Design a protein around this ligand. Structure first.
Ligand SMILES: *Cc1ccc(C(=O)N2CCN(C(=O)N(C)C)CC2)cc1
Ligand SMILES: *Cc1ccc(C(=O)N2CCN(C(=O)N(C)C)CC2)cc1
Ligand SMILES: [Cl-]
Ligand SMILES: [Cl-]
Ligand SMILES: [Cl-]
Ligand SMILES: [Cl-]
Ligand SMILES: [Mg+2]
Ligand SMILES: [Mg+2]
Lengths: 9, 227, 227, 9
């Protein structure tokens, strides 16, 4: 299950 | 980071992201938060990206070590998993401390308040992933309560296609599935979130449409895995 | 790491490698070295892998920041590049200190002595990559001298297909090309190394053949880039 | 120019 990757910004 | 200018901390956080130096990035953004001013939309993203990467590496390492420990069931594997786990809990506690002192209480706009409460849910969820019995239940309820308040605000104040609203629902659905042992709630939330966003896409520009459909695909990926 | 058993430090270094926790891995192997006993073949590999990964991330970040700094030519980019550069130099100095106290002086076998001198050349080469003028020349000569003594021993004591001999020649050729402004020396060394290994492959088992031909391909890749 | 990757062992 994927959460928000949120690793790029 | 008390002797560095706020603007310099922000500038260096952006540099650290480009250099993939996420521990530095988090320390710069921690210093920026501790200047006491509210954070802009971009600045909130920098804070979130930095700590998500830091804790993401810790979680990945914890899972590797926990798996080795399970297969073995000397003290070394347990000791080292405990070390990583303690370092992860420290980072989560640090983020939660920033949210509590004093990001959340000063966040009045829907966009900022939902963003911070989503963060609060996420980092309690990460604590819940490594918690065993004692206050596992209280940590789980802290995650639930943060996500729930964010959900209530986002449903009142944001369109169904808003990327923060969509990502909040995505992560709360992962909470239901992975943490709360409520897979039916997870599936229902993901489905309803996806369908209500689909019906609101006609209102969006081409750039907003790309932002929203990206996160909708993540909801769809989970539903495909879960059903 | 003085209160932890040598064997526990080694065990945890292997665990950290599996978890891709290379800073931990290097700290465990530093503690193991400081127990004062010589290192086994496997243990030398653990030491090398740990610090290569740590300094590799620092070098990658330094290059990102140096490029941004060059394009800009406030103080922030320079300050942060200087921070990363100082942290890189600290790690290199730490490794060089371990080699000097007292890994190299106690290494009597060709395999261990060449391995450590190759390391010494590599970490002076990393210092040379960020050095500017002042003792750039002395650092470059320190790298050259370490590589040269390793080369002399490996040519006397190891077969031309030995993976450590091959990797030493590969890195010394990179030194010539990238650091010493001697591309013809780099090309000549890579060619001669490759051809003498090719002629010795007939002596090898299937597993040794795979080990040697892997590094020979790296020599070939460089020659293709350089000619 | 590639040196020994030496990142895995
Ligand atoms: C909590 C949260 C919700 C939404 C977003 C967001 O806008 N993005 C995250 C994912 N993303 C991306 O490019 N890929 C997955 C490829 C950027 C957009 C962030 C955080
Ligand atoms: C200094 C040094 C020389 C040789 C070696 C070595 O045996 N290997 C390094 C590269 N490698 C590998 O699997 N790939 C590049 C895929 C393992 C073998 C190490 C160090
Ligand atoms: Cl430990
Ligand atoms: Cl406010
Ligand atoms: Cl800095
Ligand atoms: Cl000896
Ligand atoms: Mg100021
Ligand atoms: Mg002992």
């Amino acid at each position: 299950a994927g959460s928000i990757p949120g690793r790029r910004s | 980071m008390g002797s560095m200018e706020r603007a310099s901390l922000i500038q260096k956080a952006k540099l650290a992201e480009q250099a993939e130096r996420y521990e530095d990035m988090a320390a710069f953004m921690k210093g920026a938060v501790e200047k006491g001013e509210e954070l802009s939309c971009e600045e909130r993203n920098l804070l979130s990206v930095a700590y998500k990467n830091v804790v993401g590496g810790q979680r990945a390492a914890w899972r590797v070590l926990s798996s080795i420990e399970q297969k073995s069931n000397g003290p070394e594997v347990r000791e080292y998993r405990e070390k990583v786990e303690t370092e992860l809990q420290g980072v989560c506690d640090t983020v939660l401390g920033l949210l509590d002192s004093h990001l959340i209480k000063e966040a009045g706009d829907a966009e900022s308040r939902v963003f911070y409460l989503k963060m609060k849910g996420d980092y309690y969820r990460y604590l819940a992933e490594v918690a065993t019995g004692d206050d596992k239940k209280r940590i789980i309820d802290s995650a639930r309560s943060a996500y729930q308040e964010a959900m209530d605000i986002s449903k009142k104040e944001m369109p169904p296609t808003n990327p923060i609203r969509l990502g909040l629902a995505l992560n709360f659905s992962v909470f239901h599935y992975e943490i709360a042992n409520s897979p039916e709630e997870a599936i229902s939330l993901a489905k309803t979130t996806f369908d209500e966003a689909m019906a609101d896409l006609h209102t969006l520009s081409e750039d907003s449409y790309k932002d929203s459909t990206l996160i909708m695909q993540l909801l769809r990926d989970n539903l495909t895995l879960w059903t």
